[PDB]
Amino acid sequence: KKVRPRLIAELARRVRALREQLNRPRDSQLYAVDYETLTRPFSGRRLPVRAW
Amino acid sequence: KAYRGGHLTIRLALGGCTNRPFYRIVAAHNKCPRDGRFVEQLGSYDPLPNSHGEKLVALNLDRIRHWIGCGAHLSKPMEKLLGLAGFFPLHPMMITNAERLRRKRAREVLLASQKTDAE
Amino acid sequence: PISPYKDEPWKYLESEEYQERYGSRPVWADYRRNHKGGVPPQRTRKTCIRRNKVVGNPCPICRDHKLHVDFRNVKLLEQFVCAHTGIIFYAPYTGVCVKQHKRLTQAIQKARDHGLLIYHIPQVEPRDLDFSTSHGAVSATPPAPTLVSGDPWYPWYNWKQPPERELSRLRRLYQGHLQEESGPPPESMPKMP
Amino acid sequence: ETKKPTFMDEEVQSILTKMTGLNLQKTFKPAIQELKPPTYKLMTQAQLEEATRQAVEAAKVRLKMPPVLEERVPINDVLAEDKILEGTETTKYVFTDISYSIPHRERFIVVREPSGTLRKASWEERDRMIQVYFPKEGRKILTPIIFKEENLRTMYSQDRHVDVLNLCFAQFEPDSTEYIKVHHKTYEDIDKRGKYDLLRSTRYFGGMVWYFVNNKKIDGLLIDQIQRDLIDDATNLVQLYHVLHPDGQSAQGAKDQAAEGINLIKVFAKTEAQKGAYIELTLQTYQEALSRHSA
Amino acid sequence: LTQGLFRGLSRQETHQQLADKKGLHVVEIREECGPLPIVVASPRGPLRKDPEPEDEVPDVKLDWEDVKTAQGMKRSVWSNLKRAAT
Amino acid sequence: PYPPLLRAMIIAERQKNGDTSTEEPMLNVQRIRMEPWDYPAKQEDKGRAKGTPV
Amino acid sequence: RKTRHDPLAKSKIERVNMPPAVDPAEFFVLMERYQHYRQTVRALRMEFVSEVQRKVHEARAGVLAERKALKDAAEHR
Amino acid sequence: PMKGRFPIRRTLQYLSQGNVVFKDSVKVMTVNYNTHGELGEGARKFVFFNIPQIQYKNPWVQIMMFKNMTPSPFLRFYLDSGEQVLVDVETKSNKEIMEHIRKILGKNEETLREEEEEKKQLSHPANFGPRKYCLRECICEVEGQVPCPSLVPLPKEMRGKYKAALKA
Amino acid sequence: VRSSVHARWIVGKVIGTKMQKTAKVRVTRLVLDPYLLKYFNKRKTYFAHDALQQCTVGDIVLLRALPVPRAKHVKHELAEIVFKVGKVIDPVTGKPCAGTTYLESPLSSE
Ligand SMILES: [Mg+2]
Ligand SMILES: [Mg+2]
Ligand SMILES: [Zn+2]
């Protein structure tokens, strides 16, 4: 039962995992909030109204 | 199909035809479709009254106790069917909605009385 | 035409007119379908009568307007029921159209329900092995203490007024998004006068 | 002290079985159903008798008398009364436990009324719900119109009293009210028209005798058996009546006179039988006929 | 076909002839009639007392069409078609 | 107290087995340690936002 | 339904959901009910789990199950 | 006619008449028989007739037959635990051989009755689904319930088409 | 006790001893023909571990499944040589035989 392996699938999986660690976002970037618009500049998502 | 995570859930699968609802109580995976693959059907629920003015509900209690003990969750409508049957305590929403309905009709009585009395 | 035997369908089969035409053999005995090939179509025509007009080759039921398909006409229905097996012949067998075959099936079923038509009634075994009615499911379960005293099955079923401090805490928690506070609900469901 | 024998007692079972009789012709009548090409076997005289014996054995299973039960007590039980749900729903909910490994008389069937009261389902509701989830051949969820008075009288006019009992047994439970009324009405029509022979060699013959003895109306049955040269069964009918009614004129009369055999009927005819003169005339007619054959 | 039909029907063995040849009763078993043994023919002469040897496996030739139909392996759109009464 | 249907079945089981007692079955909710909804959870088991910026 | 890679709708860019107004009396009473209902159900759940675990153990090494195992081995010899 | 002598052997009716169902312990059954000799007459008939019946009822048991390797015929059974069961079949009819192996390594009628009852519980009459798995497809098939809209149209009050028109 | 090999006990005939500590064993099973309803031998090749290399081409052997496959194709081990090639010992009497004739009479040891 021989099946053609997928080297690139394993190669891409390791590259993505490595880059997510080397280029991981920091807390100062993830949790920064613009107090005027009440949105996070990292993702552009508005905070819930009750938390304003 | 092996989904990522998930759990078994006892829910209602809609059957029948248009304008003729009919729910089959089944124990299926959370990520499965509403009418898709299920592990074991645990009963049925007919919301439309029959010739006797009755809604027929079938509860395979022996299997229901089995799956709940195996970690199967319960959908909110299913938790109300068990409460109506007395298998489970009445769900707080059923009690809360009963109180809201009483308040709604109480205010309607006051409006009706004023119309008759004033005019 | 207006058949005088509509009120009493069984009278027609006992008349001298019936004997001269059909005799002691079924009505469909002399009827033969017209079709291409040696194998007839598995379904007969939908109806021999369309808008009060009769097709060229009427079925045995339709070809005689004095033959009325009614559950009381037991003798006629026996001609469409196999005397050895008790089953109803399909439409290609006798040659009757689909509409009249459906009428025959309803009439035969109606005759059996009223007992006018003799049919085989099999003997079955009892459903329950044990006939005891002492089990709690069918007996009277002793009442719970809550039921006797009239209290709700659980204490939290009834409305309990929250403390004043707790209500103020919620008001402070949800400033600017508060609804009118609700008192205890009516004890019984009101009705429109 | 002294307990009256029940329907299922061996003494009652033996007497009723002898009053039924195994008729291999009637017990295995050619039924009107789908037919198959019959098979044929070459059998000797010994094998043919053995095959006849097996038909006799199979006849007994088919002729097993159903048990007789009193009317079941209606179920009026309330598990709880939740007044909070009153008026929320305009249709009651019926919950039936459909667990397979549970007897149908031990299933919890409960009804949630619109008033909010949770109650156990009544007998009529329980039988209807069981057929819905556990269908049984020959039993309809809705009561067939055959059980109406007019339809049943039509069956009686056609001498099909066995068919009525077969229909009632398949549809209604033995302890149901409708089961009792149909059987009792069938028995009354049998006695009025003297149709006891229809139920002979059938499993329902025992119930007919049991109904007649408990109402002290075995006068009609006794007349028919004598006219058909069934004195052995006729004597057993009188003896069974005496057993179930120890404190009667016939029972006390039998003890005083030590009557046995034909003398038992004479004691019963004069003391308790309503048509005593007819029974004596019928018994006298048989006795004269038997004497001629003896010579 | 005509000459073949009359040939076989002329040479069929009746139950009475079979009973006389074998000197045994011929018992008919009907599923409608349950286990009730029905005697259709009895030998006019002496009756044998020794039963026929019950062979465990009969050595008879079976038509494949009959066996195939019995096992349900024979599909045919032209079989069991509804046809006029004959 | 047990829910109305469960209590009836448990009591019915006792009568079927021949046991005769008037004690009401009850649930040992003492073991259940109900917690406030604002009780802190396990930060170790909590995930982290992905690295895609906007 | 939409995937993670589907762009956000332009009409919902400025969409904001206002939380519903809270009735102080009904909120506190209902909150208590959800703390009692889930307590009872969890207690019911624990019993249901134990019954499932007991049935598995009874079938594996129960007294009746072990009796049959020794009986069959005795018959086999 | 079906080819071969004794064509009844190649019918499902004959193969399902096997009364021998091996226990879970039995794994491999080897038959050693002699092609000639009046004493091995039962062994040859056992192979000719009963072997197809045994294999049909025991599809997972390996059956390997050897001819003319020992002076007398015999049967050997290899159990799962490692025990090897030896059966002598010399001067014994195939019926006797069939009953002997059933007595020692065949499941009794009580066990077979229990197994069939377990399969009955799998098909629950109360379940609703396709005709392949369930007796009924929809609750509409139950008499007294609201019938299927395809056969009996629903009242306009119960149809959503007219519910919205009346409200708006 | 637990083993991942599907075939726990199998009896076959050795068809090759050209591999070190491994005897190539051919196993035949009766497989029903769906149409003819007659059983025909189906042959599958199994590799068996033979520590002592005592198997000879043409004998009958008993194979026991290994708990884990020691090789890619070797999943069984030589349990017992049921019938040695040319040196069959009759199980019924215990005397050596050559075909249908005993080499040593069973009456030698009574
Ligand atoms: Mg919770
Ligand atoms: Mg726990
Ligand atoms: Zn017509």
Curated annotation (Swiss-Prot), chain A:
It is found in: Mitochondrion. It comes from the Eukaryota. It is linked to Combined oxidative phosphorylation deficiency 32: An autosomal recessive disorder due to deficiency of mitochondrial respiratory chain complexes, I, III and IV, and characterized by delayed psychomotor development and neurodevelopmental regression. Additional variable symptoms include poor or absent speech, inability to walk, and abnormal movements. Belongs to the mitochondrion-specific ribosomal protein mS34 family. Component of the mitochondrial small ribosomal subunit (mt-SSU). Mature mammalian 55S mitochondrial ribosomes consist of a small (28S) and a large (39S) subunit. The 28S small subunit contains a 12S ribosomal RNA (12S mt-rRNA) and 30 different proteins. The 39S large subunit contains a 16S rRNA (16S mt-rRNA), a copy of mitochondrial valine transfer RNA (mt-tRNA(Val)), which plays an integral structural role, and 52 different proteins. Required for mitochondrial translation, plays a role in maintaining the stability of the small ribosomal subunit and the 12S rRNA that are required for mitoribosome formation. This is Small ribosomal subunit protein mS34. It comes from Homo sapiens (Human). The chain holds residues 4 to 55 of 218 of the full protein.
Curated annotation (Swiss-Prot), chain D:
It comes from the Eukaryota. GO terms for molecular function: structural constituent of ribosome. Changing R139H: In ODG7; uncertain significance. Its main location: mitochondrion. GO terms for cellular component: mitochondrial inner membrane; mitochondrial ribosome; mitochondrial small ribosomal subunit; mitochondrion. GO terms for biological process: mitochondrial translation. The modification N6-acetyllysine is found at K148. It is found in: Mitochondrion. Keywords: Acetylation, Disease variant, Mitochondrion, Phosphoprotein, Primary mitochondrial disease, Ribonucleoprotein, Ribosomal protein. Component of the mitochondrial small ribosomal subunit (mt-SSU). Mature mammalian 55S mitochondrial ribosomes consist of a small (28S) and a large (39S) subunit. The 28S small subunit contains a 12S ribosomal RNA (12S mt-rRNA) and 30 different proteins. The 39S large subunit contains a 16S rRNA (16S mt-rRNA), a copy of mitochondrial valine transfer RNA (mt-tRNA(Val)), which plays an integral structural role, and 52 different proteins. It is linked to Combined oxidative phosphorylation deficiency 5: A mitochondrial disease resulting in severe metabolic acidosis, edema, hypertrophic cardiomyopathy, tubulopathy, and hypotonia. Ovarian dysgenesis 7: A form of ovarian dysgenesis, a disorder characterized by lack of spontaneous pubertal development, primary amenorrhea, uterine hypoplasia, and hypergonadotropic hypogonadism as a result of streak gonads. ODG7 is an autosomal recessive condition.
Curated annotation (Swiss-Prot), chain G:
It comes from the Eukaryota. It is found in: Mitochondrion. Component of the mitochondrial small ribosomal subunit (mt-SSU). Mature mammalian 55S mitochondrial ribosomes consist of a small (28S) and a large (39S) subunit. The 28S small subunit contains a 12S ribosomal RNA (12S mt-rRNA) and 30 different proteins. The 39S large subunit contains a 16S rRNA (16S mt-rRNA), a copy of mitochondrial valine transfer RNA (mt-tRNA(Val)), which plays an integral structural role, and 52 different proteins. Belongs to the mitochondrion-specific ribosomal protein mS26 family. This is Small ribosomal subunit protein mS26. The gene is MRPS26. The chain holds residues 27 to 103 of 205 of the full protein.
Swiss-Prot record, chain I:
It comes from the Eukaryota. It is found in: Mitochondrion. GO terms for cellular component: mitochondrial inner membrane; mitochondrial small ribosomal subunit; mitochondrion. GO terms for biological process: mitochondrial translation; translation. One of its GO terms (molecular function) is rRNA binding. Residues 1-17 form a transit peptide. Keywords: Mitochondrion, Ribonucleoprotein, Ribosomal protein, RNA-binding, rRNA-binding, Transit peptide. Disulfide bonds: none annotated. Belongs to the universal ribosomal protein uS17 family. Component of the mitochondrial small ribosomal subunit (mt-SSU). Mature mammalian 55S mitochondrial ribosomes consist of a small (28S) and a large (39S) subunit. The 28S small subunit contains a 12S ribosomal RNA (12S mt-rRNA) and 30 different proteins. The 39S large subunit contains a 16S rRNA (16S mt-rRNA), a copy of mitochondrial valine transfer RNA (mt-tRNA(Val)), which plays an integral structural role, and 52 different proteins. This is Small ribosomal subunit protein uS17m. The chain holds residues 4 to 113 of 130 of the full protein.
